[PDB]
């Protein structure tokens, strides 16, 4: 029984979303790759390089025109005629457009693909631009976070495969299932927020009792993600549980909303 073809491309990025994907606990990334999808192109993992890789790319997007899913990590830079990110001697944006043209739908993994992330932070030297400002004629599901949670990535994949449809999304294109609520609306330190019980300086008595991180700059009140519920790395922790406020990493523009240590 054939598996759905997937093409995974990489613009300007740090590769954290790929790393997050391989951290998936259930299903294991191994079983996603072997049993759920056909990951037919991916520079990080594929055997072929160079001309052999370019042949795989061309063959898959032609053979499966209109039927593959495009996963995108990172983003295209518009500066220097696109040559801040070069793919087979040409601007990455050309490869992005070719891959997008044949896709049935696009998954924009991470804050880079969704919004811009760190390379788009002031002063955006490369004119890094999110996927939906370049590709304007295709369904784009945004899965933001730096990176998104591993088991969120894999749940989104299994939803699409099992239900044979894209997830329902909010007005920004984020899946409602994992992005419908704020971190602060499911945070286990909310009792302390409500009581005025705050960490005031690192490793103070409050910190040692797990008090709220709002005065340390937590951006949980304005950030939509699943970190406080689903949690990270097979439910082991999340930023706030280990004592650091949320940075706001799933939100557009989070790098430029003031210091991480300044209050919401």
């Amino acid at each position: 029984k054939p598996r759905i073809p997937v093409v995974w491309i990489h613009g300007l990025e740090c590769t954290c979303c790929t790393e997050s994907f391989i951290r998936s606990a259930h299903p294991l990334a191994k079983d996603v790759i072997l049993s759920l999808i056909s990951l037919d192109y991916d520079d990080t993992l594929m055997a072929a390089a160079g001309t052999q890789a370019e042949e795989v790319f061309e063959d898959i997007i032609t053979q499966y025109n209109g039927k593959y899913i495009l996963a995108v990590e990172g983003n295209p830079p518009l500066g220097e005629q696109g040559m801040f990110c070069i793919s087979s001697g040409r601007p990455f944006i050309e490869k992005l457009k070719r891959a997008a043209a044949g896709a049935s739908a696009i998954i924009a993994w991470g804050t880079c693909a969704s919004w811009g992330c760190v390379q788009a932070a002031r002063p955006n030297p490369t004119q890094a631009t999110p996927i939906d400002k370049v590709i304007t004629d295709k369904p784009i599901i945004k899965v933001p976070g730096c990176p998104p949670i591993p088991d969120v990535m894999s749940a989104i994949i299994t939803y699409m495969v099992t239900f044979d449809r894209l997830p329902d999304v909010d007005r920004m294109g984020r899946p409602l299932m994992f992005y419908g609520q704020r971190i602060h609306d499911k945070c286990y330190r909310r009792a302390h927020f409500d009581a005025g019980e705050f960490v005031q300086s690192w490793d103070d008595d409050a910190a040692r009792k797990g008090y709220c991180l709002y005065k340390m700059g937590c951006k949980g009140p304005t950030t939509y993600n699943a970190c406080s519920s689903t949690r990270w790395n097979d439910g082991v922790s999340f930023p706030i549980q280990s004592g650091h406020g949320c940075l706001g990493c799933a939100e557009n523009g989070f790098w430029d909303r003031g210091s991480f240590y300044s209050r919401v």
């Binding site: 054939p2 073809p5 990489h10 740090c14 590769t15 979303c17 790393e19 997050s20 391989i22 951290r23 606990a25 294991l28 990951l39 991916d42 520079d43 990080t44 993992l45 594929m46 055997a47 390089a49 160079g50 052999q52 795989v56 696109g82 801040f84 990110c85 070069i86 793919s87 087979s88 001697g89 040409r90 601007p91 990455f92 992330c117 390379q119 002031r122 002063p123 490369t126 730096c146 330190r189 690192w202 490793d203 910190a207 040692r208 009792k209 008090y211 990270w232 790395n233 097979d234 082991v236 922790s237 999340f238 706030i240 549980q241 280990s242 004592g243 650091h244 210091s259 991480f260 240590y261």
Partner: protein, 581 residues
């Protein structure tokens, strides 16, 4: 075409030009070109970083306390190491000393990363250069079990297991959806493993893909998440509470028990799966002890890492030794100073950046990151590079040099430095490893040697995790719980103008961040990262970097199939996002 001599090589761009773009099974974007002569031997090699983001520019004007979070996103593969170098640099600038538990926990974070990064590189990135996956379909499961059982105590070795792995591969391939295996180099004559070893290796590839997810649970406990854990200037945010009310809100005995469980499993996997597989690769590929030497018999560099005395970055503290060797003189390991303007310098005469004078090198405190895409006459156009012009600017990677010398960094470099400084564990380990392979010591200075050193380092790091965990537990037994110093958290406490250097050994090699603070904000932030060294383009003297050198003089069996190029490049674990930042 031209020819010139440098570092014992004859750099000759006559003959057929081969291009490999993209390089795959790396992090980020790289292009490589070579020329080969009539004997299909490489006579010219060109390393090109094909991405840039500009973190050094973005960091200007940030609060120094926030810098770690931005620079962490230089790279998600070596996640955490740039945060560590950042907090070190900002603390060095301001004059902050962290409590011992914070230092120990930082050391745990770094050793966890070494374990993870080295393991995933061995299997997921480099492994398919050495293991012919499709050939595993021809293996006898019983002979595979016998092979595995001769190499290791690892439990997972039954004939039925290897049959089940083989059958899963067979079903995966049978419909033509070969995925990551499509259009590979399978059957190339340089694949030397027998079918049983290919099936064993492939089974282990899958086991490592599963297992690696567990290692980073240590980062989740202390840092919240992986990738991209959290840190603070002044220590770590993971406050500890073992025996007081509200320990549920902190690092408590249950959290520590989780960490210990992961450490034990990590050491077990590395010692019984990765280490025997590395040695087996060595046994079946001995000629690669003589290929890809490059700069590893000439010039190698380590800054050192893992300060065991908190806030002491000197030789008596660093558990991973620093030093430099030049001119092939391994009897004189030289001290490195990251403030000395005559030591680390970066050149851009062959890179896409502007300096006021491109014939001189700039120490990072005088660094400039002014991007300038100017490829000259490629065959093609500015948006269609058919052939890079290595006589002019050809990369987004700057060219670092040490006292004007081109250096190799990374596991092999570190191993050589420690060995020649007379580190007893390193000397004993290396000697026993080369003895087991019936190879001379010089065999480590090679593409095979890079792989062997990486495995050795994974084992070392897994051991150090336990050592650091035990040191933390000793402190807790003595009632020393502190994880952060906050006396200089507030900007009003800082010097109006100050500068600092943060350094460490990332999985790929020597890492430094140079920061200047003025008026409470970052005035300058310059990074020189391990792959910047290794993947470096040329300098005003024409000297070549580690990758270019390692590729020189290499025979290719089949020019159109760049397996030998991939093998040597992958042996360095290229991280191109790191290199360019």
């Amino acid at each position: 075409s031209t020819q010139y001599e440098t570092q014992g090589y004859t750099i000759n761009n006559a003959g057929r030009r081969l291009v490999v773009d993209p390089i795959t099974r790396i992090e980020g974007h790289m292009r490589c070109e070579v020329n080969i002569n009539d004997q299909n031997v490489i006579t010219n090699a060109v390393s090109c970083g094909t991405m840039f983001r500009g973190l050094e520019i973005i960091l200007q004007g940030r609060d120094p306390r926030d810098a770690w979070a931005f620079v962490e996103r230089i790279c998600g593969v070596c996640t955490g190491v740039h945060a560590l170098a950042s907090v070190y640099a900002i603390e060095d600038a301001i004059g902050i000393k962290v409590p011992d538990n914070a230092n120990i926990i930082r050391n745990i974070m770094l050793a966890t990363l070494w374990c993870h990064a080295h393991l995933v590189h061995f299997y997921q990135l480099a492994g398919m250069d050495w293991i012919d996956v499709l050939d595993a379909l021809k293996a006898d499961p019983r002979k595979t079990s016998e092979l595995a059982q001769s190499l290791s105590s690892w439990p997972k070795s039954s004939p039925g297991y290897f049959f089940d792995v083989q059958n899963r591969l067979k079903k995966f391939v049978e419909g033509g959806q070969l995925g990551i295996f499509r259009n590979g180099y399978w059957g190339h004559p340089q694949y030397k493993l027998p079918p049983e070893a290919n099936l064993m290796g492939f089974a282990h590839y899958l086991e490592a893909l599963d297992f690696q997810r567990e290692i980073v649970k240590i980062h989740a406990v202390f840092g919240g998440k992986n990738p991209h854990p959290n840190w603070i200037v002044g220590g770590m945010p993971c406050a500890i509470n073992i025996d007081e009310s509200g320990a549920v809100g902190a690092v408590n005995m249950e959290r520590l028990n989780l960490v210990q469980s992961i450490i034990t499993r990590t050491a077990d996997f590395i010692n019984n799966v990765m280490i025997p597989d590395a040695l087996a690769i060595g046994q079946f590929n001995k000629p690669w002890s003589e290929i890809g030497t490059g700069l590893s018999d000439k010039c190698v560099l380590s800054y050192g890492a893992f300060p065991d005395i908190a806030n002491d970055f000197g030789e008596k503290s660093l558990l991973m030794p620093g030093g430099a060797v030049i001119n092939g003189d391994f009897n004189n390991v030289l001290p490195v100073d990251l403030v000395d303007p005559q030591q680390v310098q970066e050149f851009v005469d062959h890179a896409w950046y502007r300096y006021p004078n491109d014939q001189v090198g700039r120490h990072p405190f005088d660094g400039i990151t002014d991007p300038w895409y100017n490829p000259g006459d490629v065959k093609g156009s500015d948006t269609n590079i058919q052939q890079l012009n290595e006589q002019e600017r050809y990369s987004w990677i700057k060219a670092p040099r040490w006292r004007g010398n081109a250096m190799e960094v990374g596991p092999l470099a570190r191993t050589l430095i420690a060995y020649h400084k007379g580190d007893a564990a390193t000397v004993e380990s290396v000697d026993r490893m080369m003895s087991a392979l019936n190879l001379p010591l010089s065999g480590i200075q090679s593409t095979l040697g890079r792989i062997l050193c990486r495995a050795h380092e994974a084992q070392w790091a897994a051991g150090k995790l336990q050592y650091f965990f035990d040191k933390l537990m000793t402190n807790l037994k003595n009632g020393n719980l502190a994880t952060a110093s906050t006396e200089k958290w507030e900007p009003a406490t800082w010097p109006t103008e100050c500068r600092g250097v943060g350094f460490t050994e990332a999985p790929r090699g020597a890492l430094g961040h140079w920061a200047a603070i003025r008026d409470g904000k970052i005035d300058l932030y310059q990074c020189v990262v391990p792959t910047t060294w290794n993947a470096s383009p040329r300098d005003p003297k024409g000297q070549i970097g580690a990758y270019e050198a390692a590729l020189m003089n290499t025979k290719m069996a089949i020019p159109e199939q760049p397996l030998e190029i991939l093998r040597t490049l992958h042996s360095f674990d290229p991280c191109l996002a790191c290199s360019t930042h």
